[PDB]
């Protein structure tokens, strides 16, 4: 019988049950097919050995299926079953790969999804020394420090090395007296035979809105050992799985006045919960008319604005960040700046682009750069990342652009035309990288945009900042009767099917694909097709109270040139999307004009450009 009248901790520590368990795990490791006749732990061990990973995953449900007794012994006394399983998986691998001894000679078995997902505030004393699965954000991480694993001292009076004691993570190891000269004294470590292991400490805390309903959020410690270190960064959402181990602290006893012990989770498996084939895309891109079909895929709810849909779609995929051969460092980021009276779904345009995009971040304007911060766990005064370095390759969604402060304004402009920040702070003098595309929305002064003045008046923004934006869309309002029904019906219906009684699959994988497998080229047949427009329009604008299309608009137009290389996979400049580039670069300029000039320039060009 594999269950007799002892304590589960001490049943498994006996020689008989130990050997029985040892042999029982091998038979499961070697012979376990999964719904197709595949020895899963034959290919999985292989894929582990083709990378030198020394970490094997054991899904718990199958262990319970093929093994009824071990999957009940496990979360009772896991400080020894997870040790026996190690020596089992070793002898398996050293049979499937008899030379693997030259790679780390030690295997750890992780365990995946115990069936007992739990909260972080409901851990009571019942769970001391029991395997546990939890969840929550991580809010700190020290550096990867090396810790003793098999220490070995040396005596100071005999030149003899003491015994190889093992280090347990509750109390400093204590060597006795030298068995060679009885020289009991202050020994020192022997850096050459001692074995070390990585080490990292993190402070996990409850998820923001998940369980912290009407109270404050609790937290816990965790200790990631050798293979696990740097599995997670401050801000990630993870789900631990680890022994919940306590240890005596002398400080808490002197604050609370009672004998009180500290607790810590010795993590055993960390699995993040976040956000991480062409043959269709070939013909789907070769439709020759993917433009219309993609425009009405973003902005899924909000009706109208197929104008600004165009610009934002241009922005999303981006353009081409070519490096000029004259050391001029032209940028390949499209920055947008919405504006319009309150109540026109600007903020929703920001929030949906938060979702559809990847590696995106978000902020309000009412933290932009790295700042000195006292770490929650480590208690050292480190430096933490801001809000323009977390979009170092993706997008930065600014909200309430007007409410920025003078320091914030003098810091935002630097990153536009240089895309690189220096920090000579109290911490240390560094110069980091920031390559992000800015998507922001300002407000009209006086509670309403009025197009008698130029746009540079109702925006309430410093003038050399608006130049750092490529597109200038102006949102407004309408009282047209036939569209009142169109918008009403839509909203009402969207309130009928949301309550407890190109889709979002093509374009996400498409912004993943089309981001990568294209590199648009630049010929020189368009080089003269545009100047014929500039020579005219410069005079046309300077004639009146306005400043014509200047070089910082030609740059935006030439950037949006490639903005369609990502949608069509075209990647070759043609006189077709130049009709589009010029069209857009004037679209974002006629609106930001005067009362009668916004229409005089229209009567000229909107009929001239042959839209």
């Amino acid at each position: 019988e594999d269950l007799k009248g002892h304590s589960v901790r001490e049943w498994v520590s006996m020689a008989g049950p130990r050997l029985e368990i040892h042999h029982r795990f091998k038979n499961f490791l070697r012979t376990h097919v999964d719904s197709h006749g595949h020895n899963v732990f034959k290919e999985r061990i292989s894929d582990m050995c083709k990378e030198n990973r020394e970490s094997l995953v054991v899904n718990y449900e199958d262990l319970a299926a093929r093994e009824h007794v071990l999957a009940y012994f496990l979360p009772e006394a896991p400080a020894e079953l997870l040790q026996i399983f190690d020596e089992a998986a070793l002898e398996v691998v050293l049979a499937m790969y008899p030379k693997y001894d030259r790679i780390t000679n030690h295997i750890h078995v992780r365990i995946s999804h115990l069936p007992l997902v739990e909260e972080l505030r409901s851990l009571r004393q019942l769970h001391l020394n029991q395997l546990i699965r939890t969840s929550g954000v991580v809010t700190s991480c020290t550096g990867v420090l090396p810790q003793l694993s098999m220490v070995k001292y040396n005596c100071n009076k005999c030149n003899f090395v003491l015994g190889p004691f093992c280090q347990s993570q509750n109390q400093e190891v204590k060597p006795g007296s030298c068995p060679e000269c009885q020289s009991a004294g202050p020994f020192e470590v022997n850096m050459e035979e001692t074995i070390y292991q990585n080490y990292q400490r993190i402070r996990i805390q409850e998820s923001p809105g998940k369980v912290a309903a009407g109270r404050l959020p609790r937290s816990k410690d965790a200790i990631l050992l050798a293979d696990l270190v740097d599995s997670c960064k401050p801000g990630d959402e993870i789900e631990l799985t680890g022994i919940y181990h306590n240890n005596y602290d002398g400080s808490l006893n002197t604050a609370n006045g009672f004998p009180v012990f500290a607790t810590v989770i010795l993590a055993n498996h960390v699995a993040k919960k976040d956000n991480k084939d062409v043959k269709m895309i070939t013909s789907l891109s070769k439709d020759q008319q993917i433009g219309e079909k993609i425009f009405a895929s973003i902005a899924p709810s909000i009706y109208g604005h197929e104008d600004i849909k165009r610009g934002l779609a241009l922005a999303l995929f981006g353009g081409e960040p070519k490096n000029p051969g004259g050391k001029h460092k032209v940028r390949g980021d499209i920055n947008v700046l919405l504006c319009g009276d309150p109540g026109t779904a600007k903020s929703q345009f920001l929030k949906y682009i938060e979702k559809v995009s990847s590696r995106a971040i978000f902020t309000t304007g009412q933290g932009l750069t790295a700042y000195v911060q006292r770490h929650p766990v480590s208690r050292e005064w480190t430096l933490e990342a801001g809000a323009l370095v977390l979009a170092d390759r993706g997008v930065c969604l600014i909200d309430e652009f007007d409410k920025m402060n003078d320091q914030d304004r003098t810091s935002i402009h630097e990153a536009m035309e240089q895309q690189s920040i220096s920090i000579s702070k109290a911490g240390i003098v560094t110069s980091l990288q920031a390559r992000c595309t800015v998507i922001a929305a300002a407000n009209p002064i006086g509670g309403r945009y009025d197009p008698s003045l130029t746009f540079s008046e109702n925006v309430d923004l410093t003038e050399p900042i608006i130049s750092r934006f490529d597109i200038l869309c102006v949102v407004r309002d309408t009282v047209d009767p036939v569209q009142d029904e169109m918008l009403a019906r839509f909203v009402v219906g969207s309130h009928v099917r949301h309550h407890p009684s190109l889709p979002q699959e093509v374009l996400k994988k498409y912004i993943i694909y089309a981001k990568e497998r294209v590199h648009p080229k630049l010929n020189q047949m368009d080089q003269d097709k545009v100047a014929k427009m500039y020579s005219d329009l410069r005079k046309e604008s300077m004639a009146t109270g306005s400043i014509p299309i200047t070089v910082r608009h030609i740059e935006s137009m030439i950037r949006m040139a490639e903005a369609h290389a990502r949608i069509h996979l075209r990647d070759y400049v043609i006189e077709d999307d130049v009709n589009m580039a010029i069209r857009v670069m004037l679209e974002s300029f006629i609106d930001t004009q005067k009362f009668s000039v916004m229409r005089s320039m229209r009567k000229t060009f909107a009929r001239y450009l042959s839209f």
């Binding site: 292989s46 894929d47 050995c49 083709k50 990378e51 030198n52 790969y97 030379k99 693997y100 001894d101 030259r102 790679i103 080229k521």
Partner: protein
């Protein structure tokens, strides 16, 4: 080189392992793991690898290559020692000389590189050899990035009795193979990778014919022809006659300038006029 960058570039294990398709790149990983070679020592230069690994490397590699279908892994060559640190295999001198004479960037007449390669064979010039080993590296890392193009894009046309390919200028590192002498080796490695790659039974026994542009101003390309590949190929090529008779039939402009006959310079416009008559001629 390192032990890793020389498995990914020998055009005999870069074919079997199929080190151009992510599906079979793990084969290399498994091959390394079956020997106990840490993935951190294999990536470092060979002279700095630990001394405890390299004891019987040349045997634990021949063995663990039987388990993968590569039984011709040891060859018979010679090696030379001069002094304290000078140790050459007779197929390193060759790849260094062969790449001092065919360096892409040209610095004068046709006989300016010849002299610099004739120089690097005497022991009083170990500073050119030791330099012509950084070109031979740069070349070998810019060949598996072309045979990776014409096999993840299928630019090997089965034009009938022989395969066929061609190159594009826009692809990077295609002006390196502009010379009419450094093009034969690229084709002869392309055939070796192909024959191992394709699933057919016909294409695996057809000779290849390749063309790449020579001169943009004259608008001409260079063309070669290589025998049908196999393990025991007699190596008796037959294109010096085919191209001659084809240019004779079409009556186009050709140049048999070199000493070997199977390399020709052809007008960019007479390409198809030549090729169709050749297809009919070989039949």
């Amino acid at each position: 080189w390192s032990l890793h960058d020389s498995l990914c570039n020998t055009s005999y294990t870069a074919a079997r392992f199929k080190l151009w398709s992510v599906h079979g790149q793990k084969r290399l990983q498994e091959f390394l793991a079956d020997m106990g070679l840490p993935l951190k020592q294999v990536k470092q230069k060979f002279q700095a690898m630990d001394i405890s690994l390299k004891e019987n490397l040349r045997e634990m590699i021949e063995q663990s290559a039987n388990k993968f279908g590569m039984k011709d892994m040891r060859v018979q060559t010679f090696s030379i020692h001069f002094g304290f640190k000078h140790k050459f295999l007779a197929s390193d001198v060759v790849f260094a000389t062969m790449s001092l004479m065919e360096s892409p960037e040209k610095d004068g007449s046709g006989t300016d590189h010849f002299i610099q390669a004739l120089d690097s064979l005497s022991r009083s010039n170990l500073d050119k050899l030791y330099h012509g080993l950084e070109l031979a590296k740069k070349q070998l890392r810019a060949t598996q990035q072309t045979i990776a193009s014409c096999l993840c894009t299928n630019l090997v046309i089965s034009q009938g009795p022989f395969l066929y390919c061609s190159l594009m200028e826009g692809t990077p590192d295609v002006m390196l193979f502009s010379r009419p002498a450094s093009l034969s080796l690229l084709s002869k490695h392309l055939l070796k990778s192909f024959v191992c790659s394709t699933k057919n039974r016909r294409c695996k026994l057809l000779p290849l014919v390749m063309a790449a542009p020579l001169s943009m101003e004259h608008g001409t390309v260079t063309v070669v022809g290589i025998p049908p590949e196999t393990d025991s190929s007699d190596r008796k090529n037959f294109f010096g006659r085919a191209f001659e008779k084809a240019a004779e039939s079409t009556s186009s402009r050709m140049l048999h300038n070199h000493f070997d006959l199977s390399v020709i310079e052809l007008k960019a416009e007479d390409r198809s006029k030549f090729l169709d008559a050749l297809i009919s001629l070989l039949s």
